[PDB]
Amino acid sequence: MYELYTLLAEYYDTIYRRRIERVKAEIDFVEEIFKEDAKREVRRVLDLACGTGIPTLELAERGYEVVGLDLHEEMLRVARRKAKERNLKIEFLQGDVLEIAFKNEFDAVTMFFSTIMYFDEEDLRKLFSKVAEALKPGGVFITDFPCGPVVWNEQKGEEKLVIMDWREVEPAVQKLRFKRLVQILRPNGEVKAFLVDDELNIYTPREVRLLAEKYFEKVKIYGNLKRELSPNDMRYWIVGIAKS
Amino acid sequence: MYELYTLLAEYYDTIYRRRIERVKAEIDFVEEIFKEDAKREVRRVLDLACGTGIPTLELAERGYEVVGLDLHEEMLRVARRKAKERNLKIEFLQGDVLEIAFKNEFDAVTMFFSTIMYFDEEDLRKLFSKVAEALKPGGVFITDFPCGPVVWNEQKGEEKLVIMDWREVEPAVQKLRFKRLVQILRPNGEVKAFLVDDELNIYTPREVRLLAEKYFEKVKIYGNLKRELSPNDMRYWIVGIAKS
Amino acid sequence: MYELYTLLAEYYDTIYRRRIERVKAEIDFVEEIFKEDAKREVRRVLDLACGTGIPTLELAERGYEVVGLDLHEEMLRVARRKAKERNLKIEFLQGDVLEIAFKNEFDAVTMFFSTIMYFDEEDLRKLFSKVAEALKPGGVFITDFPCGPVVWNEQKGEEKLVIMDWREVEPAVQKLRFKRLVQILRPNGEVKAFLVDDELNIYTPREVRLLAEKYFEKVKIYGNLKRELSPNDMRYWIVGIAKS
Amino acid sequence: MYELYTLLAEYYDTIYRRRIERVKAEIDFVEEIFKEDAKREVRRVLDLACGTGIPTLELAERGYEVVGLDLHEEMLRVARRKAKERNLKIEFLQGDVLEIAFKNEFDAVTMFFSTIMYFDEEDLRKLFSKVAEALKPGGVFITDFPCGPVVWNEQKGEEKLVIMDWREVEPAVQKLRFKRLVQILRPNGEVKAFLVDDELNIYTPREVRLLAEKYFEKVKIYGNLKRELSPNDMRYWIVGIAKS
Amino acid sequence: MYELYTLLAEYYDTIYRRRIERVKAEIDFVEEIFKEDAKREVRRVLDLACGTGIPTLELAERGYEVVGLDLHEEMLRVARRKAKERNLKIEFLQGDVLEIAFKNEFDAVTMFFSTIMYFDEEDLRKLFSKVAEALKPGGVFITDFPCGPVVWNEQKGEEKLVIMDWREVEPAVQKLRFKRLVQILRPNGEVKAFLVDDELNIYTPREVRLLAEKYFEKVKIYGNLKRELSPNDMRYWIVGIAKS
Amino acid sequence: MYELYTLLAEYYDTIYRRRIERVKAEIDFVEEIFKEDAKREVRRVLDLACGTGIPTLELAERGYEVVGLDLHEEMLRVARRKAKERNLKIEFLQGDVLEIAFKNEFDAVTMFFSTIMYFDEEDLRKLFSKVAEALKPGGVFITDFPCGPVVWNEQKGEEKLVIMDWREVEPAVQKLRFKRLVQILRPNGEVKAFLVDDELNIYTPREVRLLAEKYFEKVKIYGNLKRELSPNDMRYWIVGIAKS
Ligand SMILES: Nc1ncnc2c1ncn2[C@@H]1O[C@H](CSCC[C@H](N)C(=O)O)[C@@H](O)[C@H]1O
Ligand SMILES: Nc1ncnc2c1ncn2[C@@H]1O[C@H](CSCC[C@H](N)C(=O)O)[C@@H](O)[C@H]1O
């Protein structure tokens, strides 16, 4: 597990070129949540499992004081490099999100790009509990998650990446095995291959809300970058608002 | 909605011939639950949304004192007819399960064949609350639910039924539109057709346990007629045990 | 052929409830075309193969002087009924679009909802030629077209419609056989069924442009209700602008 | 079973319009087999399970003396009617092919259009045994066989036929349940529907040969109207040649 | 051909980890067959095409005197290694099963895991003939057989295996081309790949029986580890019982 | 782009072994066109984008005086090598087909195997214009084109090729991204991989005829190696006849 965040860390931004191309639209939505859902001015944000800091840097660019936390130093290495290149001041920390000990010191806490799926029910409750403890009164928690083999390609410099994704689902226990073979091709034909194989957890929007309402005064479920939920939306946002 | 239980009531057992052919194995499992999970002797059972009483009669046949409740008299008419023909004594009552008012008088309450899907979150909570009140200490609540067009046929007397089912899912709001066209063919080619169109709710096993855990001391999740849950099971059983 | 416009005419608006629900967004786009693409003020519009007048009435409601033409009186009957009920003054005429003889008297000519598909190459050229002759200098022609069995349902009063669609394509000759079985169910189960079976022609956006550029000074291809064309758009609009 | 040959007999030729359009191509092949595989002159032919006599009539028209045998009078009625209309002399008899008692009476025995699928292993042996008895030395036995829901349509006069086929396969016992809903639509929308539900047997080319070799000194397997078998052929022909 | 048994021999047990996890369940069934179908005591067993001896070892472990025969030394090397490690006495021989010359020497002869698919009709007869010669009166012959691209993965120590299977079928000649790309990934990304490309033969339960009945006084067809055959079983077992 | 014609040039004929195995039938058709459609005797032929010269050599072998032109020297190297080995005299030239300047000097111009797809509308017009100039009166222009991942394999010497193809279509702009991963496996498992990634253009038969009709007196559309077009043909041939 975590092959994507260690050995493939330097290729993460390449693999997720699309996610980056639309980070601005996503943070526009996040700021609307800060403005309409939060019950306090949002200035300091804790971005959990920040990875290479794609949304982290976008938030920083807009004036937020951001602290990013990630389990893997290989990912943080990339985030710090980009922050330095863009003259953005962000505090990047290594650590497990389940072990944070911040106490009512962030106006908002975020977890971007389906990361709640890495946690089972017990760990998710632990996470939400720690997030609630990290928030200032009226602060908000924001996290997004989604509803044979597929092949695609990207390119980093002279290296071409051919990626093949497939999944194995176990509905009864709400588990999903996400597999991704990444082949890195050099100009002369030499190849290197790495296999991502992570166990993920499947949750419905209602499930997350039920688990979250236990830690936040109010929880909202939104879809498709709008502060509303439509029947056919395919990506969801859970917004937890701390009592003020 | 409810076309299947009103206009098509007399055709229900024909449409669900398969469900009937395996009711004995299902009740064998239910008795195992009464034995291993219930904390009191099970004698009096309340079967909610009993329909034509397929599992209701099988329980009665084994000596249980059963009370069956259903919203539609058309379904109850079939249940009573079969009970009479089989010399089984069962009290069949018409009524909404959400309006029951029984108090500490049933050793076990059941709801067979995916009927929880007819209730949204709010009504499901209301249902579980009333079920808990109806149960006696150590009593158990048992209910089962599942994980373009598909056509199949059955026959009742001289009439042949061609059934076409299809679904429309709204994932965001966890809603499912179950559509079923039932064509009834007579020997001379004359046809009568009826459209079933019910709005159903989509729940995961974890989700139901969460909503139920609030009303029962303990809640268990089982699969495929075994007091355990395997990764690939496709039919689930939720068992609520009243504190004893 | 044309079963949908004769025997099923009174059910057309029911079958296409969705098309109606979004006619306002479509005419908003049409007016943007009038404003930005036309080289003259648009007041009088000829709506060819107007059917039940869905977009025809919407245009009339907005102040345009509209003339609607359709081959089938059964469709016009519906259009006139709705126009009268809404106090909209529209001149509805019966006739073949390939036989129009209007001479430079319309500011714009429209053909809505994939109707160019009913015409093969030769007839399409004839149509475009007649449309060009009907337009005032700087006027515009606007028409939209799209890129096992599928079942769905609608309802008109007490009647329920179960619709099954399937197609048979002949790529070599760019022909498509559009088939639709419409079953009309009455409350007591009695049913009436009609089969739509029309031969349609398949065209690419570039094909239509090449055929249209021969009759209009300038032709534009737009997609998805925007005066631009994106790689993945699935519905197209051809806009022909007459020399001014 | 047999609904297609009784209640739907008068619609058989309509449903199998294509099977008819290429009957000449098929008989050309059959004659090639008489000429190259038969070790005697073929004059008198016994066409088993002749149905509406589609190939039976084509043979007679070419000078062959043919006797057609079928279990259903409803099918023979159509065959005789066509034989009469085309002034072709053919002896059409009603009877079960498993009960024939002919002996050294025919130069060739045929069974067209996948009918062997109606007989299980035991009955197929009985049939082959009877066919061998009916043949004259050097005579030949010829029969063809192939390797949802799917909806299609046809038309007979003013009546339109909408046909929906689907199958249920039992691989272990090599059984196939072929279902076909035939809806007959009148111009005014009135409908008549019949359900075809036959149990068929699945055989591979190898199987048939192994079963036939026991009764014919020589058994050949051909495909796609050629006296050869290619790896990807999808329609097979078994030819049994009686010892001369 | 045979790439899986030569170049990939040391990876066979990894690729077929599941086939191994249920070897005990399979031998339980095999013993049931020895006990109920064999007309003599089974002590000495000949396991044809034994491979890495997965079932061979399970039999020996239960007291049977087993002789394993395989064409490839690379596979036997693995079997002997495991036999040694588990201190099991087994005589592993290299040789072609089509060339065995045993006579009235074994109480039972086995061929596990679909290997009959490697032989065409002619060679399958030769094999069955040899097996019959090798058996003692009342002895039994047992063999199982079943009814893309698909990608899956496994792991042996630090090496990860990504396997991609696809097939090319020739229905007419009942041939199957089974292709499998096995990519072996080292932790540093280095890769080794081998392509499995075997020609296999397609047989139905009926076929095998017809071919076997010629050499065994009694031939039975079973499915899903039970001495019975159900309509939907997908894995079959052929049991040949020598005349006693 | 062009990876297939540069780095993989020496593997082209192996990858397209099938295309080669049927070149004779294709040239048989081409000669029929020279005979029935050309209005002059065909002796000198210009084969544009000749590649490794598969059809080029077949034409030369039949006595035609051929000039082959290709953008990539790597492909021409293979063509010249084969011509030399087969003692065929052909003039192979390097160059862009869009830059040809031949005038009234070829009896026929050809472009085999879907190469028109490499040109957008503008370049295709430019190409047809230059082809017309290169032809002599009554001369003919002939070109053929077709109507997740798919894996297959081939072999060149000791090297095995596993090829995985997939496509990404942009219907609105009629663009297609043809992707092909070619993995070259050596006996010891070592691998070399190359990614083909070309942008292609999608045209219908009618569309090509429209663009061509502008440069040739007559243009014909044929399908499946016959001087006619059938409804279900999947490969098309466009034939331009210069006015004679
Ligand atoms: N327990 C845990 N604690 C901290 N980070 C974790 C974690 N489990 C997973 N992660 C981190 O989850 C991240 C998922 S990738 C998503 C990255 C980033 N938020 C974005 O929007 O692009 C990885 O960087 C991984 O290292
Ligand atoms: N609110 C409600 N109260 C009581 N019955 C209800 C109900 N909503 C739906 N039902 C009943 O739900 C039943 C579903 S059919 C399943 C029937 C039966 N338990 C069996 O196992 O076969 C119908 O008989 C319907 O009338």
Ligand SMILES: Nc1ncnc2c1ncn2[C@@H]1O[C@H](CSCC[C@H](N)C(=O)O)[C@@H](O)[C@H]1O
């Ligand atoms: N040759 C022709 N002349 C006039 N109308 C024609 C025609 N061929 C088809 N039609 C008409 O094409 C219409 C297609 S239905 C689309 C209707 C309408 N424009 C809308 O947007 O809803 C039918 O009303 C049919 O009668």
Ligand SMILES: Nc1ncnc2c1ncn2[C@@H]1O[C@H](CSCC[C@H](N)C(=O)O)[C@@H](O)[C@H]1O
């Ligand atoms: N036991 C049996 N004896 C005689 N005919 C039989 C039969 N079982 C089925 N059939 C006949 O099988 C026929 C199959 S339909 C094929 C008909 C015809 N040979 C053709 O080529 O078109 C039906 O007409 C049916 O009545």
Ligand SMILES: Nc1ncnc2c1ncn2[C@@H]1O[C@H](CSCC[C@H](N)C(=O)O)[C@@H](O)[C@H]1O
């Ligand atoms: N003609 C032949 N003679 C002996 N073994 C053969 C053979 N053709 C194929 N095989 C062997 O067939 C085996 C198939 S693999 C199945 C192995 C083993 N019986 C099990 O149950 O796991 C390979 O080990 C291969 O070497």
Ligand SMILES: Nc1ncnc2c1ncn2[C@@H]1O[C@H](CSCC[C@H](N)C(=O)O)[C@@H](O)[C@H]1O
């Ligand atoms: N602009 C251009 N000018 C010349 N050749 C071109 C070209 N664009 C692509 N090609 C050539 O297109 C060829 C396509 S491969 C088809 C090759 C050959 N006609 C056959 O039938 O097998 C390649 O050899 C490539 O180099």
Ligand SMILES: [Mg+2]
């Ligand atoms: Mg845990």
Ligand SMILES: [Mg+2]
């Ligand atoms: Mg025409």
